[PDB]
Design a protein around this ligand. Sequence first.
Ligand SMILES: CSC[C@H]1O[C@@H](n2cnc3c(N)ncnc32)[C@H](O)[C@@H]1O
Ligand SMILES: CSC[C@H]1O[C@@H](n2cnc3c(N)ncnc32)[C@H](O)[C@@H]1O
Ligand code: SF4
Ligand code: SF4
Lengths: 340, 337
Amino acid sequence: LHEIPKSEILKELKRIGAKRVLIQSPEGLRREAEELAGFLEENNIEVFLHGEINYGACDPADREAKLVGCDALIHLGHSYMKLPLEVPTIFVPAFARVSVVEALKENIGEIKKLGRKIIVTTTAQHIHQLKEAKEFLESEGFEVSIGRGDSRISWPGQVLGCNYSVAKVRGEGILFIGSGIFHPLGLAVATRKKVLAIDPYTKAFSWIDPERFIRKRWAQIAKAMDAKKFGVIVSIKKGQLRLAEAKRIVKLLKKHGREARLIVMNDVNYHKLEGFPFEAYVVVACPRVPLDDYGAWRKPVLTPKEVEILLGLREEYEFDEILGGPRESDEPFGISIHST
Amino acid sequence: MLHEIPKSEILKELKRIGAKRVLIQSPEGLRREAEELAGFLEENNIEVFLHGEINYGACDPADREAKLVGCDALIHLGHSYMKLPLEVPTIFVPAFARVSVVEALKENIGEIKKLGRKIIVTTTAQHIHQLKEAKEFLESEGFEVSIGRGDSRISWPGQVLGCNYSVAKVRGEGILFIGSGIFHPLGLAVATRKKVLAIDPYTKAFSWIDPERFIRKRWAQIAKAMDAKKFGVIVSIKKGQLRLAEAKRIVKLLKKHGREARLIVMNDVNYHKLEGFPFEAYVVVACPRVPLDWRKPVLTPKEVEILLGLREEYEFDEILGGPRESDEPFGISIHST
Ligand SMILES: CSC[C@H]1O[C@@H](n2cnc3c(N)ncnc32)[C@H](O)[C@@H]1O
Ligand SMILES: CSC[C@H]1O[C@@H](n2cnc3c(N)ncnc32)[C@H](O)[C@@H]1O
Ligand code: SF4
Ligand code: SF4
């Protein structure tokens, strides 16, 4: 459950006959990746570690595995999203232990301000708590709405930084259970509904006001109203490649008398591009890169949605989401194995 | 200042193969030139994508990436071809420097005479097109000029790379190196065990190479590493840098000497990516220019062979190729494997 189940992982590997495996890992599970590796090697399975810092299941290292002759990939810390996989892949999601009900009870008076029918949302590390959160809220008199989400989502109620489809359901206001600010803000902007965030660790709460964020984006668009040369960036990460939408933005920019060039990268960062003559950039990939820029972009960097405001093709601010298709099943609360 | 990109020649080669969508990679210097070429190809009804990575060598063609985004051809700016399986037709565009090499030699005749009569002459890609003149000059000064063909990693006789000095493994009293920087002459010195004179064509300055300080600094890394139980052994998936068999051997050997070792797979080998891993020391088995330029000790395969005591003298790590059939043109080339 909350422990890396080294036994279950071995059993799946021995079932599909895996002899050589690659392990991806996010920054907080680097040490666990090497402990797993040593355990499988004791059990006669050669193990490579993937040296890149992985940021999501949108970026499986399956093609790299097939290159170094691995017959399977282990993806630590995230759950499957619908992608073609070139080697059989085991997803090992990370579940935080914290019980969320305590923070809900402490804040029930604020939660009432959301209204009778509420939408409840959290991130992957608290997804297993969602049933406990639901029972409690219903037991206090709420009707609880929880969206399934699309094929980029792994369980009902789960939000990603670039996908909030699980909140596009009937309901009067949105509850977010989790730490930090980016997800609740994305909820408010993507749904235009009252969003209430509760941190399960501190029990602190926050009503999300997107105005401050939206104004910072309006200034970004303003800095680019001066620009004539545009770079339009795609990432070739399997779950981030948006070729058609990027080509669309290039054609659109040219239709309005601006120069635009499509740029192919893997990891998207400004330093690699600063020798180029472009005056502003459009990231058509993970929107957390232009929207959550800590300060590294020294030229205006925009989302596709913001570009359409710039050219004057859209009046209201719309959050850039990467959307999937119908998801006919749900991922387990545990390890999963996928091959295509 | 380099010689200008030949836009007309490149476009004609693309039309000769009917290319409709091309990807262009460029190195740090040639970013403005990349987009200049893109606009010209586009104005000739050819869709062009730019590669946003900083390319660092023909050992890293972006041909897989081009195939992925639907391009039917790849333009590799600033480097000459090295023997590699290519997935899309690729056009190589060497950059050649305008600066006069012979003017630099003329300022330093006296220093060159100290090398010997029969001398080995080497340069980098940006001056290869003036290598014939430099040799004629030197032979007019009484030198016997010895120039090696080199192997399949090399594009022209007498060209050195940061990772391959095969053109210098020939008969001679000493090595002359024509180019800027100190890394190439350092490797030349360690790899050939001969006296090396470096002449910088842009400044006319010269330098007699003494590798001792560099070797001593390298042993401090080796010494540091002699206490480590846990090693990370790194490879790069770049087509010209992948050294999987050697990396595996290094793993097996570290384990035979009572040390733990893990193979690590990367594209760009950056230390900042590895900080969370539990390894006490690192071996880069890819482009040697990365360990030979951290926080934990990071070693080349030659250097870890010293730590384990299977090797005594210091050695530069090099990626060797095999025999080279023919030579690359002093201009644009087009290959498709
Ligand atoms: C937590 S996953 C999102 C984070 O990972 C990084 N990230 C995700 N996808 C990419 C990408 N394609 N290129 C560069 N950085 C990315 C971004 O900095 C973002 O803050
Ligand atoms: C310019 S020739 C090679 C240069 O690019 C960088 N480089 C080459 N290969 C790699 C690699 N595999 N990973 C990271 N940096 C590299 C090195 O720091 C060196 O300065
Ligand atoms: S927010 Fe961006 S980085 Fe995170 S899962 Fe979605 S696409 Fe991947
Ligand atoms: S391996 Fe190193 S020195 Fe050789 S071409 Fe690539 S980056 Fe240059």
